[PDB]
């Protein structure tokens, strides 16, 4: 789902 991509981006950007 393309609509879930930015949530993934937000999580990976928060983590590291």
């Amino acid at each position: 789902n393309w609509f879930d991509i930015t949530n993934w981006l937000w999580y990976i950007k928060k983590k590291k």
Partner: antibody
Amino acid sequence: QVQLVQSGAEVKRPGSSVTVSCKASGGSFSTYALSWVRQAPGRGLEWMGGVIPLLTITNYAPRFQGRITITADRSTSTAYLELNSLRPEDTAVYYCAREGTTGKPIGAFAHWGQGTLVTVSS
Amino acid sequence: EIVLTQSPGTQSLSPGERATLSCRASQSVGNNKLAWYQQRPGQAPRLLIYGASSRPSGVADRFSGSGSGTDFTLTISRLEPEDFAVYYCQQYGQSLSTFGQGTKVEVKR
């Protein structure tokens, strides 16, 4: 607060191509999804497609695939919709819409531009 | 493609009445990614509910979303004058997002 400001109304001849712009301010541009939604006179909303600027990843509705290009320019925080081979049934208000946040993106469209009336006519 | 059906397309209701608006999907909506919008004539749509039941800050708590899978409902607990407007549902649980055709809530007299 995020604000989206679109370019103004345009009259376009049948068969031509239109570019509509959407300039964002007040938030982070690159990592949030920006979509285009249109509304023909007296009709409902129709999702056309969207872009995630950082990744240059577009996602178009099959109805428009082959006739639409959505692009984003981080240098000016502006997104663009191109729609080609215009016909009278493309007369509509075109809106850009950006996903909301809680911040964490929510997918649904919290932030809308003011709309751009594109009239396809001779 | 997921088809969203909003039926009926108009509801005639009285001020102060409860409204329930249905959205039925042709197949299960992934992760309950279903949003509701309000639109008034001359204005852009406004987000009321996302994720089937979550309400953005600023949205009146008289609006509530419920449901899952293929059957979603927007409830307006008590219609205020400004609530007479058009409501759209939208699913974004697949890359091809789709809208319902809308339901106009109009004043019964």
